Design a protein around this motif. Structure first.
Motif, PDB file in Angstrom:
ATOM      1  N   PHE A  92       0.859  -1.199   0.000  1.00  0.00           N
ATOM      2  CA  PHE A  92       0.000   0.000   0.000  1.00  0.00           C
ATOM      3  C   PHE A  92       0.897   1.253   0.000  1.00  0.00           C
ATOM      4  N   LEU A  93       1.955   1.287   0.820  1.00  0.00           N
ATOM      5  CA  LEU A  93       2.858   2.475   0.839  1.00  0.00           C
ATOM      6  C   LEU A  93       3.557   2.579  -0.526  1.00  0.00           C
ATOM      7  N   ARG A  94       3.914   1.447  -1.102  1.00  0.00           N
ATOM      8  CA  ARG A  94       4.538   1.412  -2.424  1.00  0.00           C
ATOM      9  C   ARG A  94       3.590   2.019  -3.471  1.00  0.00           C
ATOM     10  N   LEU A  95       2.310   1.635  -3.391  1.00  0.00           N
ATOM     11  CA  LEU A  95       1.276   2.083  -4.350  1.00  0.00           C
ATOM     12  C   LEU A  95       1.046   3.587  -4.200  1.00  0.00           C
ATOM     13  N   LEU A  96       1.057   4.025  -2.949  1.00  0.00           N
ATOM     14  CA  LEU A  96       0.987   5.435  -2.601  1.00  0.00           C
ATOM     15  C   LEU A  96       2.155   6.201  -3.292  1.00  0.00           C
ATOM     16  N   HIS A  97       3.357   5.638  -3.232  1.00  0.00           N
ATOM     17  CA  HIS A  97       4.490   6.239  -3.982  1.00  0.00           C
ATOM     18  C   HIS A  97       4.218   6.203  -5.514  1.00  0.00           C
ATOM     19  N   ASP A  98       3.776   5.057  -6.023  1.00  0.00           N
ATOM     20  CA  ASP A  98       3.565   4.902  -7.512  1.00  0.00           C
ATOM     21  C   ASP A  98       2.480   5.892  -7.978  1.00  0.00           C
ATOM     22  N   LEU A 113      12.113  -3.584   4.944  1.00  0.00           N
ATOM     23  CA  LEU A 113      11.070  -4.073   4.054  1.00  0.00           C
ATOM     24  C   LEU A 113      10.491  -2.962   3.181  1.00  0.00           C
ATOM     25  N   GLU A 114      10.573  -1.687   3.629  1.00  0.00           N
ATOM     26  CA  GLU A 114      10.204  -0.529   2.773  1.00  0.00           C
ATOM     27  C   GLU A 114      10.973  -0.513   1.435  1.00  0.00           C
ATOM     28  N   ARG A 115      12.300  -0.598   1.489  1.00  0.00           N
ATOM     29  CA  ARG A 115      13.125  -0.702   0.258  1.00  0.00           C
ATOM     30  C   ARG A 115      12.814  -1.961  -0.524  1.00  0.00           C
ATOM     31  N   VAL A 116      12.680  -3.119   0.158  1.00  0.00           N
ATOM     32  CA  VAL A 116      12.387  -4.374  -0.556  1.00  0.00           C
ATOM     33  C   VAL A 116      11.031  -4.219  -1.297  1.00  0.00           C
ATOM     34  N   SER A 117      10.085  -3.527  -0.682  1.00  0.00           N
ATOM     35  CA  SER A 117       8.799  -3.323  -1.381  1.00  0.00           C
ATOM     36  C   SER A 117       8.927  -2.455  -2.649  1.00  0.00           C
ATOM     37  N   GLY A 118      10.098  -1.864  -2.890  1.00  0.00           N
ATOM     38  CA  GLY A 118      10.260  -1.077  -4.104  1.00  0.00           C
ATOM     39  C   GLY A 118      10.113   0.429  -3.871  1.00  0.00           C
TER      40      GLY A 118
END
Ligand code: CL
Ligand code: ZN
Length: 274
Positions: A92-98, A113-118
């Motif tokens: 969800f945080l990744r999608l928020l960035h995208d 895990l933040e970095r691993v999530s992309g």
């Protein structure tokens, strides 16, 4: 005036909120299987015996560390890259960035895990440090995290090839300064038009007091087991609590935003690489 979760989703959907700052702690990674400090039963407060600790914080304290580095390095060995995977909260945080909404993600987690999530490093402040790098406790020589990996995985305390000092991963311990990137908070928090707080007890400073540094017109949405910290003692009028499981809270917001199918495709693709 008294906001609901749906009001916050509408502010995003209407583009009234364009610059989201996010503050997270260990409660976002317990769904990945990584125990926090304070959850009943599974939290380190209830499992001191397994780490041979007198209390949970000693694992991040220098006097106890130099006395007996083994409990910390057991945790290092558990949290070293490869072992755990990000869960729906991270994606969800990744999608928020995208979706162009992430001003910055401030984390107390050391699980990476933040970095691993992309999420790109430029969007992240790993405020309590990282296992990606390490420093001799004696001569201060820096090392890539890779350099001490064999020793960490073999339960050997890493030692410096120059001075034989203990080589300590760049995790911020109590009493230590947070990293220089943390100072991004000076410009990030006034610029934010939305604060999200997820999965933390807000019991460690100066990270916790950052919840106070957004403008009084900015909504602060907590998604957490309980009401915590400066949100519980200094509530502002535009604060919203979504209490309960963090992922269930995230799922309700994501569905109000209209992102559910995109989020599920994202999770499917990303977790399957790993
Ligand atoms: Cl630094
Ligand atoms: Zn050294």
């Amino acid at each position: 005036g008294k906001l609901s979760l749906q009001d916050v989703a509408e502010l995003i959907r209407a583009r009234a909120c364009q610059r989201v700052v996010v503050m997270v702690g260990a409660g976002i990674s317990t769904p990945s299987g990584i125990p926090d400090f304070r959850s009943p039963g599974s939290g380190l407060y209830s499992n001191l015996q397994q780490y041979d600790l007198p209390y949970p914080e000693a694992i991040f304290e220098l006097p106890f560390f130099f006395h007996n580095p083994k409990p910390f390095f057991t945790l290092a060995k558990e949290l070293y890259p490869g072992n755990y995977k990000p869960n729906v909260t991270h994606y969800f945080l990744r999608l928020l960035h995208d979706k162009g909404l992430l001003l910055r993600l401030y984390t107390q987690n050391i699980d990476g895990l933040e970095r691993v999530s992309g999420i790109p490093a430029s969007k992240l402040v790993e405020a309590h440090g990282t296992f990606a790098s390490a420093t001799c406790t004696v001569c201060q020589r820096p090392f890539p995290g890779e350099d001490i990996r064999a020793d960490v995985m073999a339960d050997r305390v890493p030692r410096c090839p120059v001075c034989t000092g203990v080589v300590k991963p760049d995790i911020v311990f109590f009493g230590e300064p947070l990293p220089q990137r943390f100072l991004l908070h000076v410009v990030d928090f006034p610029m934010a038009d939305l604060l999200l707080i997820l999965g933390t007890s807000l019991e460690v400073e100066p990270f916790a007091s950052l919840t106070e540094a957004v403008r009084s017109s900015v909504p602060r949405l907590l998604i957490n087991r309980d009401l915590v910290g400066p949100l519980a003692w200094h509530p502002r009028s535009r604060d919203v609590a979504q209490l309960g499981d963090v992922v269930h809270g995230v799922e309700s917001l994501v569905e109000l935003l209209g992102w559910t199918e995109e989020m599920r495709d994202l999770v499917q693709r990303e977790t399957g690489k790993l």
